[PDB]
A paper describes a structure:
The Gabija system is a newly discovered bacterial immune system that consists of GajA and GajB. GajA is an OLD nucleases family protein, while GajB belongs to the SF1 helicases. The Gabija complex has sequence-specific DNA nuclease activity and prefers circular rather than linear DNA as substrate, its activity is more sensitive to concentrations change of nucleotides compared to GajA alone.
The resolved structure shows that the Gabija complex adopts an octameric ring structure with four GajA and four GajB. The whole Gabija complex resembles an octameric ring with three 2-fold symmetry axes. The three dimensions of the octameric ring are 171 Å × 143 Å × 91 Å; The inner diameter of the ring is 35 Å at the narrowest region. SEC-MALS results show that individual GajA and GajB exist in the form of tetramer and monomer respectively, supporting the hypothesis that the octameric ring of Gabija complex is formed though two steps: the tetramer formation of GajA and subsequent octamer formation of Gabija complex. Despite being present in the cryo-EM protein sample, domain 2A and 2B could not be traced in the electron density map, demonstrating that this region is quite flexible in the Gabija complex. Size exclusion chromatography demonstrates that the NTR region of GajB indeed binds to GajA, while the CTR region of GajB doesn’t bind to GajA. There is a highly conserved region (E379, E383, D432, D434, D511, D513, K541) in the Toprim domain. Non-specific DNA cleavage activity is only detected in the GajAmut1.
Residue numbers in the entry:
A (entry chain D), B (entry chain C): -1 to 156, 263 to 575
């Protein structure tokens, strides 16, 4: 693989006590603690940009203003594909020596700084090379370091004209050096469509490579592909989590909706996954009637539709975001019917915990049986298979995965029984609600009372909302 | 009704040639031409804030730098409920005279300015009162005008602490004057959840009243209620459209999802309305395979689910946003079944054009007929009712409203027939796709080819995508 960033071990910086967060060329930093993201970007500027090193470090630049500690930010680089990667050649041409033949792939770039009290100016002492144990003397011919011929920081901070012309300027002038775009909040004066355009140029075109993107709007993350997403936790003590966000060719067709839905959820402290928009309407009504500040204390309703949760689960778990999923046990037929049914409702929850896909179970449904009787038989079979796999359901509850008894609507009817009958005035309100999920769900929500909302919220079969709200 | 702003007739300003856009206390300005929104906010500052009047007008402050023309911005106020509206008392206590007894409700506040060439300083000559024809001499005791005791502009431009403490400061200090918050892009350094919080305090709490909000992120418009949404058109010649955005008590329950979906669509030049997420997946795949820049040249996929389009149609039409709707003719039963069916697929399209709701039509479906035969009978009835109302369908095509022959999936099968059979390998792929819309639609999209996408795009039954793409 081409040359890629690997890790940065920021220690005793303005806010970073001791963090070793992985990197990979295309980087995205977001989340809480805007000062944390700003400090991370300025740490990269200190490690790579000469325009920031010359000012040195101050008393405030250290962690808790404690001048005793030493700033040590160590960028880690991975080198491979020497004969075809131009940037690898750019990095290894300037470095003369200090590269042990044992490990020609790894390359450290550290930055040691100790504060002196006789002058109140912490000197930036670059010490880069290939091994942490042994460092040779850096040339440092005056103000320009040897690193200055390799890594030049192009700082973008607000105007689409500048973004459009930086491509031309770098292509025609900065070919020799490696460009590292440290973009900090480019959504300041860009429209939603402008944010989409900038995301398309960033995450798809090769003109922006090795870029560190700071964003606060989900629109800038609509085209994420093989990047490294970095999320800063909400605590004042900065904790950052990293995840390779790459879409498989299986999800390539649905990549647009996948990214559009996941980008908004990336900024939520707690994310709840749902299948259909009727579930969205019901959960939104319940939350508005019990806790309208769910979006405020950290919450989201991620509508995934079909596909699988595997990509969503990996992305949400790697960033450390609270993981909540409520799903419906659905038995879908495939190829020849009448005895062929998959277990997507359960096959998903198995795939989230790994294991293996269940075989296509066979249900003996007579041909003459149809309509209400067929649905009753399917519900009985779903109840039987749910009662059979009690251990798997227990593991899902232990791993914050919620699976319905048969379907979501049956759980809703169990939580509130008389309210459904009063609203729909039918002997079988569940069947009527399944007849047209959207319109009937809207009608149910419009006539849904606060007491009914509280009953739904406090029921154990709807514990997803309780987990989303939190303490 | 309480005192409310009514209109501002900005003439010959920095970019506004001649515009008379309505106002109402809670105002939102967004869209293209960020300079246009900035000029509008500075026009309000000139008309109300003394901190901007003292600098006067410059050569650049006029339209096309033509000093011959005269700046004339005329704010229009509506006065009512005198005995209970404190702000009405605040406005009418300072004004002594100049209020004709014939019209005590309307109140103009103009601002005339002519450029002199002997000093190169356009004097701001305030002329306010109650009638355009006759104006009495304004007191103007020095630097502070008589208006300065009524309207004080609180300019907010980046930090949630300032927003939190402006409430306290205005409540404890600015009780006597009328506060007019001219908020310009508060999303500069606010998170998505912070934007939601600010929107909640703005559009719900009474502490922010008479505020002019400029936004570029849809997250700030998640709580819109009885405000006046102002959209600037994309042309360099500024055109602004206004609309009262108020939710009826019928839509109050679904208000959260309504606003969440509509806020994003508000920033799109062209908006296409869809019902289900499977439609979203299909349209996204087709667009990505024919025109990935649909989000760039102006486009959106508004998922409305159930409810009605009436609120959406009114909002999108009033702002002047291109209106595109693709819908499915669905016959939903109500109360006692077997002969009772509504025409939501057609009742909607009728309600969008006004008229009256069709009566609940009766379909003679025998009880023994079920499953495939019942669906076939329903499709035949839908085809018959579509062929019956050719004139209504022609009007919908004339008004950019697209109604399916029977359903969307049937139109998709008509557009591409062999591709569906190849992908699903079933004698009736449409029935299988309706069996589980989400998963089967995902499977179809994953195996959908570029030639099939082009065929779907160029077919007349999918003209919604062609209209969304445009020339």
């Amino acid at each position: 693989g081409p040359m890629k960033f690997s890790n940065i071990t920021i220690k005793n910086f303005r806010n970073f006590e001791k963090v070793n967060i992985n990197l990979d060329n295309k980087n995205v930093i977001f989340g809480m603690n805007d000062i944390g993201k700003t400090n991370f970007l300025y740490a990269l500027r200190f490690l790579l940009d000469k325009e920031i090193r010359k000012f040195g470090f101050n008393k405030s630049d250290y962690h808790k203003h404690d001048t005793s500690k030493k700033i040590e930010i160590i960028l880690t680089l991975d080198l491979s594909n020497y004969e075809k990667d131009e940037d690898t050649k750019k990095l290894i041409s300037v470095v003369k020596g200090a590269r042990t033949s044992a490990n020609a792939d790894v390359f450290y770039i550290a930055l040691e700084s100790k504060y002196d009290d006789k002058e109140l100016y912490g000197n930036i002492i670059l010490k880069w090379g290939s091994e942490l144990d042994n460092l040779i003397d850096i040339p440092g011919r005056g103000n320009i370091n040897a690193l200055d011929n390799v890594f030049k920081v192009i700082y973008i901070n607000p105007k689409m004209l500048s973004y459009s012309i930086y491509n031309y300027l770098a292509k025609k002038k900065y070919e020799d050096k490696i460009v590292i775009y440290l973009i900090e909040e480019p959504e300041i004066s860009l429209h939603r469509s402008m944010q989409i355009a900038l995301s398309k140029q960033l995450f798809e075109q090769s003109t922006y490579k090795y870029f560190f993107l700071s964003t606060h709007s989900p629109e800038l993350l609509y085209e994420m592909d093989n990047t490294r997403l970095i999320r800063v936790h909400s605590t004042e003590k900065v904790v950052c989590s990293s995840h390779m966000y790459n879409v498989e060719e299986a999800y390539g067709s649905v990549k647009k909706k996948l990214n559009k839905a996941l980008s908004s959820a990336l900024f939520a402290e707690r994310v709840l996954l749902i299948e259909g928009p009727s579930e969205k309407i019901l959960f939104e009504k319940v939350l508005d009637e019990v806790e309208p500040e769910y979006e405020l204390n950290g919450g989201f309703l991620l509508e995934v539709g079909g596909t699988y949760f595997n990509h969503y689960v990996c992305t949400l778990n790697d960033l450390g975001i609270t993981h909540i999923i409520k799903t419906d046990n659905d038995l879908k037929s495939k190829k020849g019917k009448k005895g062929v049914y998959e277990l997507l409702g359960l096959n998903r929850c198995l795939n989230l915990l790994g294991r293996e896909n269940l075989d296509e179970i066979t249900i003996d449904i007579p041909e003459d049986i149809k309509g209400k009787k067929k649905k009753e038989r399917l519900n009985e079979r779903k109840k039987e298979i749910f009662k059979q796999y009690k251990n798997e359901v227990g593991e899902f509850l232990g791993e914050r995965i919620y699976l319905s008894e048969i379907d979501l609507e049956n759980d809703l009817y169990s939580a509130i029984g008389e309210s459904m009958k009063r609203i729909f005035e039918n002997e079988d309100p569940v069947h009527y609600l399944q007849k047209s999920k959207l319109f009937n769900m809207v009608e149910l929500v419009n006539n849904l009372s606060t007491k009914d909302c509280f009953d739904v919220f406090e029921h154990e079969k709807f514990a997803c909302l309780k987990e989303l709200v939190g303490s």
